[PDB]
Amino acid sequence: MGFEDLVEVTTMIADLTTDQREALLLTQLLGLSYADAAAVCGCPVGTIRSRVARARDALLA
Amino acid sequence: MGFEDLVEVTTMIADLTTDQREALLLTQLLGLSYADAAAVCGCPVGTIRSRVARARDALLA
Amino acid sequence: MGFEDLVEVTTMIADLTTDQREALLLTQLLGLSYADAAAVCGCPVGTIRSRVARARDALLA
């Protein structure tokens, strides 16, 4: 209704690339800084900044 | 079990208005700034701010 | 595909303590401050601070 939404959201997500979904989950579900996210993943901060930017465009298509 | 909660939750949430649900996910699941969210929803910040404010009330009572 | 994670994940946030689940949820889903979360839960901030720290650790294990 209601559930109709989260549903479709839940699926975007899942339509994200493995990387963007990881990046977004790290920074939003756990809510790590980009710094902490980048330590977890072992990449430049810029990398996460990017994966999340694109996750966000993806999700607001 | 936790299993109970998450469903416990996601029903509450599903539940919300629509416009709260949108604001909340836009800011917590997307982690968009109020300003950015407001841009996305074509309404002033104050609005986004209070919608999430209400989203927190329905979730916590 | 991309659901394989959301379940792997959401299956994890089910394992967490509950006291960890709560903390993490309030601060990340509700996007509450630690002070607010601590308030809500009836504990000092230090405890929430750590609960979400352990909470984060567990889901990254």
Q: Residue B59 is nearest to which of C14, C21, C30, comparing CB atoms? A: C30
Q: Which residues contact B16 (CB under 8 A, 6 or more apart)?
A: B24, B55, B58
Residue type, B40: V
The DSSP symbol for C29 reads I
Q: Can you read off the two tokens belonging to residue C52? A: 């979400």
3-class DSSP assignment, residue C44: coil
The resolution in Å comes to: 3.0
Expressed as residue numbers, the domain containing A7 is: 1-61
Q: Residue B27 is nearest to which of C10, C14, C31, comparing CB atoms? A: C31
Contacts across the B-C interface (CB distance below 8 Å)? 27
Contact C59, C44 (CB under 8 A): no
The DSSP symbol for C32 reads -
Q: Exposed/middle/buried for C27, CB within 10 Å: 0-12, 13-18, 19+?
A: buried
Nearest to A13 by CA among B9, B30, C2, C26: C2
φ, ψ of residue C56 in degrees (nearest 5): -65, -45
Q: Residue C2 is nearest to which of A13, A28, A40, comparing CB atoms? A: A13
3-state secondary structure A7-54: HHHHHHHHHCCHHHHHHHHHHHHHCCCHHHHHHHHCCCHHHHHHHHHH
Nearest to A43 by CA among A32, A55, A51, A31: A51
**Best residue of B6, B7, B29, B52 to probe chain C, by most C CBs closer than 10 Å:** B6
- Which chain A residues are within 8 Å of B10, Cβ to Cβ? 6
Contact A24, B28 (CB under 8 A): no
Q: Can you read off the two tokens belonging to residue B25? A: 């996910």
The answer to whether B29 contacts A28, with C-beta atoms less than 8 Å apart, is yes
The answer to whether C29 contacts B9, with C-beta atoms less than 8 Å apart, is yes
Rounded CA-CA distance A38/A24 in Å is 12
**CATH code of residue B3:** 1.10.10.10
Residue owning tokens 């504990």? C43
Provide the number of structural domains found in chain C. 1
Q: Exposed/middle/buried for B52, CB within 10 Å: 0-12, 13-18, 19+?
A: buried
Q: ∠A43-A48-A51 over CA atoms, to 5°?
A: 125
- Which chain A residues are within 8 Å of B25, Cβ to Cβ? 9
Q: Can you read off the two tokens belonging to residue A2? A: 């209601």
Q: Which residues contact B7 (CB under 8 A, 6 or more apart)?
A: none
Rounded CA-CA distance B45/B36 in Å is 9
Cis peptide before A46 (omega within 30 of 0): no
Angle between helices A45-59 and A18-25 (to 10 degrees): 100
